[PDB]
Design an enzyme around this catalytic site. Structure first.
Site, PDB file in Angstrom:
ATOM      1  N   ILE A 110      -0.082  -4.946   2.422  1.00 11.92           N
ATOM      2  CA  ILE A 110      -0.788  -3.937   2.293  1.00 11.92           C
ATOM      3  C   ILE A 110      -1.559  -3.752   0.804  1.00 11.92           C
ATOM      4  O   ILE A 110      -1.985  -2.543   0.500  1.00 11.92           O
ATOM      5  CB  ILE A 110       0.208  -2.543   2.663  1.00 11.92           C
ATOM      6  CG1 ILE A 110       1.371  -2.458   1.938  1.00 11.92           C
ATOM      7  CG2 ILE A 110       0.484  -2.217   4.123  1.00 11.92           C
ATOM      8  CD1 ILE A 110       2.043  -1.370   1.943  1.00 11.92           C
ATOM      9  N   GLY A 111      -1.163  -4.726   0.110  1.00  6.70           N
ATOM     10  CA  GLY A 111      -1.263  -4.445  -1.341  1.00  6.70           C
ATOM     11  C   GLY A 111      -1.169  -5.862  -2.172  1.00  6.70           C
ATOM     12  O   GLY A 111      -0.430  -6.736  -1.685  1.00  6.70           O
TER      13      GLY A 111
ATOM     14  N   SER B  67      -2.475  -9.021  -9.684  1.00  4.31           N
ATOM     15  CA  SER B  67      -2.289 -10.260 -10.642  1.00  4.31           C
ATOM     16  C   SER B  67      -0.877 -10.883 -10.406  1.00  4.31           C
ATOM     17  O   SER B  67      -1.324 -12.058 -10.072  1.00  4.31           O
ATOM     18  CB  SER B  67      -2.666  -9.956 -12.137  1.00  4.31           C
ATOM     19  OG  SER B  67      -3.885  -9.564 -12.130  1.00  4.31           O
ATOM     20  N   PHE B  68      -0.062 -10.473 -10.341  1.00  2.00           N
ATOM     21  CA  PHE B  68       1.347 -11.372 -10.175  1.00  2.00           C
ATOM     22  C   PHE B  68       2.101 -10.273  -9.289  1.00  2.00           C
ATOM     23  O   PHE B  68       3.573 -10.651  -9.314  1.00  2.00           O
ATOM     24  CB  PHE B  68       1.859 -11.157 -11.751  1.00  2.00           C
ATOM     25  CG  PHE B  68       2.610 -12.580 -11.943  1.00  2.00           C
ATOM     26  CD1 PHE B  68       4.022 -12.454 -12.326  1.00  2.00           C
ATOM     27  CD2 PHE B  68       2.001 -13.662 -11.829  1.00  2.00           C
ATOM     28  CE1 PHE B  68       4.847 -13.388 -12.694  1.00  2.00           C
ATOM     29  CE2 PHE B  68       2.740 -14.776 -12.115  1.00  2.00           C
ATOM     30  CZ  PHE B  68       4.074 -14.787 -12.427  1.00  2.00           C
TER      31      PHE B  68
ATOM     32  N   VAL C 139       2.868  -9.008  -4.715  1.00  2.00           N
ATOM     33  CA  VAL C 139       2.378  -8.717  -3.342  1.00  2.00           C
ATOM     34  C   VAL C 139       3.011  -7.383  -2.759  1.00  2.00           C
ATOM     35  O   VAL C 139       4.266  -7.482  -3.042  1.00  2.00           O
ATOM     36  CB  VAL C 139       2.575  -9.996  -2.573  1.00  2.00           C
ATOM     37  CG1 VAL C 139       1.864  -9.752  -1.130  1.00  2.00           C
ATOM     38  CG2 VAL C 139       2.143 -11.221  -3.316  1.00  2.00           C
ATOM     39  N   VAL C 140       2.250  -6.471  -2.161  1.00  2.00           N
ATOM     40  CA  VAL C 140       3.085  -5.295  -1.650  1.00  2.00           C
ATOM     41  C   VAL C 140       3.158  -5.494  -0.011  1.00  2.00           C
ATOM     42  O   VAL C 140       1.828  -5.493   0.485  1.00  2.00           O
ATOM     43  CB  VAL C 140       2.654  -4.114  -1.941  1.00  2.00           C
ATOM     44  CG1 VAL C 140       3.479  -2.954  -1.478  1.00  2.00           C
ATOM     45  CG2 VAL C 140       2.805  -3.867  -3.589  1.00  2.00           C
TER      46      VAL C 140
ATOM     47  N   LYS D 132       7.413  -4.340  -2.474  1.00  2.00           N
ATOM     48  CA  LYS D 132       6.853  -5.187  -3.800  1.00  2.00           C
ATOM     49  C   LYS D 132       7.517  -6.375  -4.158  1.00  2.00           C
ATOM     50  O   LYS D 132       8.653  -6.273  -4.649  1.00  2.00           O
ATOM     51  CB  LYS D 132       6.639  -4.012  -4.968  1.00  2.00           C
ATOM     52  CG  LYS D 132       6.137  -4.759  -6.086  1.00  2.00           C
ATOM     53  CD  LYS D 132       5.643  -3.405  -7.002  1.00  2.00           C
ATOM     54  CE  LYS D 132       4.402  -4.131  -8.106  1.00  2.00           C
ATOM     55  NZ  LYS D 132       4.035  -2.799  -9.098  1.00  2.00           N
TER      56      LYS D 132
ATOM     57  N   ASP E 166      -0.884   2.927 -16.966  1.00  2.00           N
ATOM     58  CA  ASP E 166      -1.798   2.340 -15.783  1.00  2.00           C
ATOM     59  C   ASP E 166      -1.914   3.561 -15.013  1.00  2.00           C
ATOM     60  O   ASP E 166      -2.006   3.340 -13.772  1.00  2.00           O
ATOM     61  CB  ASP E 166      -1.280   1.226 -15.307  1.00  2.00           C
ATOM     62  CG  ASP E 166      -2.446   0.274 -14.287  1.00  2.00           C
ATOM     63  OD1 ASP E 166      -3.286   0.786 -14.506  1.00  2.00           O
ATOM     64  OD2 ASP E 166      -1.759  -0.381 -13.560  1.00  2.00           O
TER      65      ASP E 166
HETATM   66  N1  LIG Z   1       5.175   2.488  -1.606  1.00  2.00           N
HETATM   67  C1  LIG Z   1       4.532   2.376  -1.317  1.00  2.00           C
HETATM   68  N2  LIG Z   1       3.972   2.710  -0.134  1.00  2.00           N
HETATM   69  C2  LIG Z   1       2.571   2.201   0.252  1.00  2.00           C
HETATM   70  N3  LIG Z   1       1.784   1.580  -0.433  1.00  2.00           N
HETATM   71  C3  LIG Z   1       2.161   1.247  -1.536  1.00  2.00           C
HETATM   72  C4  LIG Z   1       3.403   1.634  -2.238  1.00  2.00           C
HETATM   73  N4  LIG Z   1       3.476   0.921  -3.222  1.00  2.00           N
HETATM   74  C5  LIG Z   1       2.350   0.165  -3.643  1.00  2.00           C
HETATM   75  N5  LIG Z   1       1.301   0.403  -2.326  1.00  2.00           N
HETATM   76  C6  LIG Z   1       0.112  -0.066  -2.369  1.00  2.00           C
HETATM   77  O1  LIG Z   1      -0.094  -1.280  -3.017  1.00  2.00           O
HETATM   78  C7  LIG Z   1      -1.102  -1.566  -4.113  1.00  2.00           C
HETATM   79  C8  LIG Z   1      -0.390  -2.196  -5.193  1.00  2.00           C
HETATM   80  O2  LIG Z   1       0.851  -1.632  -5.770  1.00  2.00           O
HETATM   81  P1  LIG Z   1       1.386  -1.752  -7.220  1.00  2.00           P
HETATM   82  O3  LIG Z   1       2.739  -1.621  -7.117  1.00  2.00           O
HETATM   83  O4  LIG Z   1       0.303  -1.514  -8.077  1.00  2.00           O
HETATM   84  O5  LIG Z   1       1.363  -3.432  -7.203  1.00  2.00           O
HETATM   85  P2  LIG Z   1       0.623  -4.304  -8.151  1.00  2.00           P
HETATM   86  O6  LIG Z   1       0.479  -5.608  -7.468  1.00  2.00           O
HETATM   87  O7  LIG Z   1       1.470  -4.482  -9.592  1.00  2.00           O
HETATM   88  N6  LIG Z   1      -0.691  -3.724  -8.315  1.00  2.00           N
HETATM   89  P3  LIG Z   1      -1.505  -3.435  -9.971  1.00  2.00           P
HETATM   90  O8  LIG Z   1      -0.323  -3.242 -11.074  1.00  2.00           O
HETATM   91  O9  LIG Z   1      -2.252  -2.055 -10.044  1.00  2.00           O
HETATM   92  O10 LIG Z   1      -2.484  -4.333 -10.546  1.00  2.00           O
HETATM   93  C9  LIG Z   1      -1.164   0.206  -4.440  1.00  2.00           C
HETATM   94  O11 LIG Z   1      -2.357   0.735  -5.077  1.00  2.00           O
HETATM   95  C10 LIG Z   1      -0.981   0.857  -2.866  1.00  2.00           C
HETATM   96  O12 LIG Z   1      -2.254   0.799  -2.343  1.00  2.00           O
HETATM   97 MG   LIG Z   2      -1.505  -0.498  -8.932  1.00  4.43          MG
END
Ligand SMILES: Nc1ncnc2c1ncn2[C@@H]1O[C@H](COP(=O)(O)OP(=O)(O)NP(=O)(O)O)[C@@H](O)[C@H]1O
Ligand SMILES: [Mg+2]
Ligand SMILES: Nc1ncnc2c1ncn2[C@@H]1O[C@H](COP(=O)(O)OP(=O)(O)NP(=O)(O)O)[C@@H](O)[C@H]1O
Ligand SMILES: [Mg+2]
Lengths: 350, 359
Positions: free
Chosen positions: B37-38, B41-42, B44-45, B60, B156
């Site tokens: 679902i996400g 850079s480093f 995967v969600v 995450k 952020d």
């Molecule tokens: N608890 C959650 N429920 C549903 N979707 C989620 C949740 N946490 C994160 N996401 C989705 O996954 C995306 C990325 O989550 P994030 O924790 O920012 O991960 P990242 O890989 O560190 N991204 P980023 O730091 O912004 O470059 C979010 O913008 C949401 O669309």
């Molecule tokens: Mg994010």
């Protein structure tokens, strides 16, 4: 059939204004600074770009000062400039009358990626070589472009001529004078810029050039990211984690700050199979952490990746001869004159 | 993915997880229907379905440096707030890279983001009803009042990091991957925060910035929800500062000093009246709030808690306020001492009379 007539100063030569008439004015572009129009000179029928920017009548326009000094086949020519007033009363606009150039590397690269194809390597060679000549030239005057990106690489698709444009971020870099770190577009910013260094050199343009090369090979940006953090992670994913020494070279203040420990991804595996080894070699010598380790533009022109351009039987796919590739001046070769024996091949200019 | 089994066709993953809060009493957790679902850079969600309760969670997965402790984990473990996505439990595993350790944060699943919602309305050439703008922004300002009260700056704040339940109108701040405790005197990196939402002190490369960068960012989110597009777009910092200057006007010598002392040559442009920035009939209270968030002088910007108490949110404090779909608003007035610590007297505005009525 609406004619505009101005008294405009030639870009080059003595400050001797002449009457210039133009027609068929339509907006080719809008930048943050101002609007760009296309127009047809009434006398010649030659098409021109007019770049209009608001001018603080008191101070001198850096972009104008720089372009008046520039005369190179791979840099867009300043034909005239003139002042006009409109909109708010007491608001003066500088107008740069440039050679019209119909395409950009951005648009041409976007066509090939949309159609799931890559730009044929012969064009990657032609375009990058002409970019590196344009950089060799401005760097010889201590001028750094500081906004090297595909949108600022104009193309004549028929002649395969590339013209560097947009000197709005351009500045003579003097050793020991600090410069702003917030210049240069997102994907093309050198790591020292991302680390907020103010003591950077013209080698930021070489990193930017390397980012354009990589992009034309991959069919997409090599170091994408919405944040500096995201960009640095994408750089680290390819170059590996920079050593404390490498960090000191970029911005010394950022040594204690920490990022993930990753080993360099082999450059050959970064690009698709049957990407020419010489293209990959050149990338690795452009996209270097240590600014002083990066090839100079002139060294880049002499790289084996451009050997096909120096072949006496090389032609454009449309059948035409290559454009001017070998008309080097002393100024252009000043960084390393001995390279002339590589850059000017036996068949050229006799 | 410590242990994997099959259950009536479906693949089941069973892991032993440390609870987010409380003492380290490991919990056995089984989930199925894993999908992405996400990406980051480093990071995967994943979405996953817990086997017993059937309720959805987000996992995450980020690479864990064996050297140091994970800062995102350390920070999320301390946080308990209705407008911050809950860390249920965390566990370690292998992943895409053999001989490499992955930290897995199991979070409450939230189906939407402010990004996706705002984009739906932009594409359809509509704007979000202002009641949603009030609810989303007010809840964001609460989340920032809470973390800032621990000295933690998010760094952020952007629509993609604002999770939404569309039915309940509940907003949860997520992504503490850039989050850090700011300590007066200690320098901090200027290359954090997504480009459109970066405070000018960041663009100028300041390392002595405060938690007020999050307030600038929230200002950018509000303006964007009102405009239908980013207020300060740009491919370069230069382009961004031009857009900022077109609105705020040219910063004074003293305004530049307040932002970054170290820092030249920008057009002498006068401030656009904030009213002419937004579409006609944009509530004046919305425009006033924006002007008090999007200030050059970091110290001149409202605190999160002052933002909450702004007159733009008066409708949320109305006792008869409902969601358009008929339901009650989410919790807006369950403030803690911690949450109020920056200015406890603001409670007289923040907690409306009807919320103090005896149960
Ligand atoms: N608890 C959650 N429920 C549903 N979707 C989620 C949740 N946490 C994160 N996401 C989705 O996954 C995306 C990325 O989550 P994030 O924790 O920012 O991960 P990242 O890989 O560190 N991204 P980023 O730091 O912004 O470059 C979010 O913008 C949401 O669309
Ligand atoms: Mg994010
Ligand atoms: N001589 C020209 N011929 C044709 N198109 C041109 C010419 N100069 C500029 N353009 C087009 O107009 C765009 C913007 O012009 P540019 O000189 O970059 O102005 P700007 O307002 O300073 N933009 P930028 O600095 O990149 O933010 C270019 O990317 C081209 O697509
Ligand atoms: Mg440009």
């Amino acid at each position: 059939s609406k004619v505009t007539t101005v008294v405009a100063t030639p870009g080059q030569g003595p400050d001797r204004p002449q009457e210039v008439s133009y027609t068929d004015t339509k907006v080719i572009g809008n930048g943050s600074f101002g609007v760009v129009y296309q127009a047809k000179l009434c006398d010649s029928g030659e098409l021109v770009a007019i770049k209009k920017v608001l001018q603080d009548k008191r101070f001198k326009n850096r972009e104008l000062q720089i372009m008046r000094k520039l005369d190179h086949c791979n840099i867009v020519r300043l034909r005239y400039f003139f002042y006009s007033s409109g909109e708010k009363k007491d608001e003066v606009y500088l107008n740069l009358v440039l050679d019209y150039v119909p395409e950009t590397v951005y648009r041409v690269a976007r066509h090939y990626s949309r159609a799931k194809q890559t730009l044929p390597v012969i064009y990657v060679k032609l375009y990058m070589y002409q970019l590196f000549r344009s950089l060799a030239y401005i760097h010889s005057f201590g001028i750094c472009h500081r906004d090297i990106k595909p949108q600022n690489l104009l193309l004549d698709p028929d002649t395969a001529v590339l013209k560097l444009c947009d000197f709005g971020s351009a500045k003579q870099l003097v050793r020991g004078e600090p410069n702003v770190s917030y210049i240069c577009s997102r994907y093309y910013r050198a790591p020292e810029l991302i680390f907020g260094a103010t003591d950077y050199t013209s080698s930021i343009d070489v990193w930017s050039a390397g980012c354009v090369l990589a992009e034309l090979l991959l069919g997409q940006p090599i170091f994408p990211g919405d944040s500096g953090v995201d960009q640095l992670v994408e750089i680290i994913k390819v170059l590996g984690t920079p050593t404390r020494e490498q960090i000191r070279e970029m911005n010394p203040n950022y040594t204690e700050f920490k990022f993930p420990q990753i080993k360099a991804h082999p450059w050959t595996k970064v690009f698709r199979p049957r990407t020419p080894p010489e293209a990959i070699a050149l990338c690795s010598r452009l996209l270097e952490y240590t600014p002083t380790a990066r090839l100079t533009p002139l060294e880049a022109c002499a790289h084996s990746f451009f050997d096909e351009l120096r072949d006496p039987n090389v032609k454009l796919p449309n059948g035409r001869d290559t454009p001017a590739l070998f008309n080097f001046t002393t100024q252009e070769l000043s960084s390393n004159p001995p390279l002339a024996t590589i850059l000017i091949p036996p068949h050229a200019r006799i």
